[PDB]
Amino acid sequence: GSSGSSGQASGHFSVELVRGYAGFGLTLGGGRDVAGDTPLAVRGLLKDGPAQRCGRLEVGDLVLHINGESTQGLTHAQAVERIRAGGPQLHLVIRRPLSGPSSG
Numbered sequence: 001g002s003s004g005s006s007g008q009a010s011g012h013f014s015v016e017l018v019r020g021y022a023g024f025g026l027t028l029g030g031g032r033d034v035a036g037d038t039p040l041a042v043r044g045l046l047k048d049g050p051a052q053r054c055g056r057l058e059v060g061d062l063v064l065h066i067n068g069e070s071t072q073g074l075t076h077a078q079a080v081e082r083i084r085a086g087g088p089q090l091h092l093v094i095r096r097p098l099s100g101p102s103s104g
Helices: 050-054 076-085
Strands: 013-018 026-029 041-045 063-066 089-094
Touching: 013 050, 026 076, 063 076
Parallel strands: none
Antiparallel strands: 013 089, 026 041, 063 089
16 A cells, blocks of 8 residues: 555554463453443553553553554454454554643
8 A cells, every 4th residue: 555654743652562471461441332432441451461561551541543443443342353363463552641640
């Protein structure tokens, strides 16, 4: 197709990890479910896992896309799939929300 061109203040970042052992040890909470519509966001981090170690992913992070694919139509089960099928390398688009730092 075409290489394309990206911006600088993209805002969103990608996540690169290496299959540690039988998965990445990353869990997601919420997402688009028939019992409710919620924005996909990391839930639990497999202790001593590739996700927690990296520190790039934390509980609460919001997911906008995955493996360069639009999740606007991918459910909690559809998203995970793309991840596993992604291959030996994981790629997820996470964009931290806009919040203020706690002060005393």
